[PDB]
Ligand binder design. Structure first.
Ligand SMILES: CO/N=C(\C(=O)N[C@H]1C(=O)N2C(C(=O)O)=C(CSc3nc(=O)c(=O)[nH]n3C)CS[C@H]12)c1csc(N)n1
Ligand SMILES: CO/N=C(\C(=O)N[C@H]1C(=O)N2C(C(=O)O)=C(CSc3nc(=O)c(=O)[nH]n3C)CS[C@H]12)c1csc(N)n1
Lengths: 112, 114
């Protein structure tokens, strides 16, 4: 049901987790590298999800801020995107946001 | 400054009142300038009449963090969350050709107009 959406519109939850929705975390260019074991398992049910989601772009900002491309490979036609989002280092929450992001970025490297 | 400007950049939404340039900067070739949008999309933002056919490819917050390669960089300008990824078009969708035309129409369109 949740799995019938195009990948880019899926919402991961406990019932349909980040692995089920977006594949396993890993180093390859086609894989996602973000999330510790708790976030992977809980998705948007993760207790600190709101603090992560604040960094996710609106549809307008995704198409507004990103460098957008199209590539045709053996596997199909792809809309590529890259960009950068500046953290608000003036907010008191800055230091905690850094700790949160650092806990999830490439977290899979330490999994048993 | 407009209240629409007071959102963090990534949470800003461009419209006729507060346009793509105002919200997200002039389109251009540089590494973290946006390169997407013709003159009509730039002016109109989500008011563009074909916005829905573009937005269908935009990621949910969950998918943005699930699909993308995420990094952090600390530089003289601040701390930046970097992202890269790719979203697969459905080449079985009868509307696929038209999706490709619409995307291509906005990708690097700025090159053809001041
Ligand atoms: C009828 O529009 N009234 C507007 C308005 O929305 N402003 C416009 C503005 O600068 N826009 C632009 C453009 O930027 O080129 C355009 C595109 S330019 C254009 N469109 C045509 O369809 C056409 O036949 N010829 N041209 C030259 C559309 S109106 C808008 C307005 C703003 S304040 C006020 N009192 N009226
Ligand atoms: C002397 O005319 N000056 C014009 C002009 O083209 N006049 C209008 C005319 O009859 N057209 C009308 C309409 O009739 O509604 C419209 C439709 S309304 C509209 N279209 C947009 O694309 C947009 O972004 N916003 N809006 C509100 C377009 S301009 C033109 C103009 C356009 S940009 C600019 N600086 N001047």
């Amino acid at each position: 049901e949740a799995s019938k959406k195009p990948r880019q519109k899926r919402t991961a939850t406990k019932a349909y987790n980040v692995t089920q929705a977006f594949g396993r975390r890993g180093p390859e260019q086609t894989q996602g590298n973000f999330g510790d074991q708790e976030l992977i398992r809980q998705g948007t049910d993760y207790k600190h999800w709101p603090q992560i989601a604040q960094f996710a772009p609106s549809a307008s900002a995704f198409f507004g801020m990103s460098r957008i491309g199209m590539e045709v490979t053996p596997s199909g036609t792809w809309l590529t995107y890259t960009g950068a989002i500046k953290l608000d280092d003036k907010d008191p929450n800055f230091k905690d946001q850094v700790i949160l992001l650092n806990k999830h970025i490439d977290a899979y490297k330490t999994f048993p």
